């Protein structure tokens with residue numbers, strides 16, 4: 070139950086440590102504690118501003134013999150300013166250098182969204198995406214073994230299908246917002262049908278991010294099932310995603326929560342309680358408000374997300 074299989078043949082551990090908003094001063098101990106506790110998957114990004122400190126914690130884990138490199142699944146992501154095909158391998162190499170790794174298990178296009186190299190998120194810096202050219206550069210990173218799997222993030226089933234149609238190396242993963250509040254049934258089915266793995270980001274509904282407006286652990290259905298099964302609301306949210314065949318990326322820098330977030334394997338949500346997830350109102354929490362704009366290729370939220378419910 071503790072891994073899913075990618076179209077590359079690789080195993081992705083079902084639970085990964087999230088590192089968004091894990092500040093440099095705390096991320097190291099979080100990664101170190103998480104892997105000692107049994108985590109074998111770390112989700113990273115250049116734009117999280119902490120990959121050097123993650124690299125220092127991975128180095129410590131390897132040097133203390135907690136794990137070997139081959140035991141871990143490390144993900145990073147190509148930021149929106151590195152979409153130019155010549156820029157892709159250089160961005161991967163920057164993350165490899167900071168993480169002090171020879172390869173990533175997964176390198177993702179972070180968003181189907183592009184800005185001019187080295188610029189800030191601001192509408193004059195928006196450039197028309199060229200996802201096929203960017204993917205082509207991602208495929209050479211895969212050929213080189215520097216990214217043992219390549220994938221995408223924040224791609225609707227429409228944009229994922231458009232890319233699959235021209236890919237000589239299919240995306241292994243589409244990492245999207247997915248939790249009881251945003252169940253992604255269409256993309257779930259699409260990913261199952263195309264052999265693409267769905268990794269759930271913000272699987273608790275990112276309760277530490279106020280601008281995301283998440284309420285997932287306060288959902289009556291979640292609190293009820295938690296009370297019925299003797300689990301925490303977080304455990305119920307995480308287990309739901311795992312039973313859908315999705316990997317989850319719970320973020321914590323708290324040792325007790327890091328441990329509880331891995332305790333999602335030796336118990337199940339009965340089918341009758343799975344039925345109750347129907348009653349949860351659906352709302353996307355990470356809407357991409359800042360890349361939907363008259364200056365954007367996405368003039369509306371519908372254009373960015375292709376209408377998904």
Ligand SMILES: NC(=O)C1=CN([C@@H]2O[C@H](COP(=O)(O)OP(=O)(O)OC[C@H]3O[C@@H](n4cnc5c(N)ncnc54)[C@H](OP(=O)(O)O)[C@@H]3O)[C@@H](O)[C@H]2O)C=CC1
Nearest residue numbers: 087088089112270271272273274275277303319320321322
């Ligand atoms: N565009 C993309 O591809 C995106 C990727 N991601 C990835 O997904 C990860 C997870 O999503 P994220 O938005 O961070 O949010 P999560 O849904 O993982 O929620 C994290 C928050 O929940 C708290 N928390 C963690 N465990 C528990 C628990 N057992 N009970 C109660 N509260 C808990 C954390 O606090 P504490 O630390 O105190 O435990 C933190 O405030 C990110 O960190 C990142 O790696 C996220 C968003 C976008």
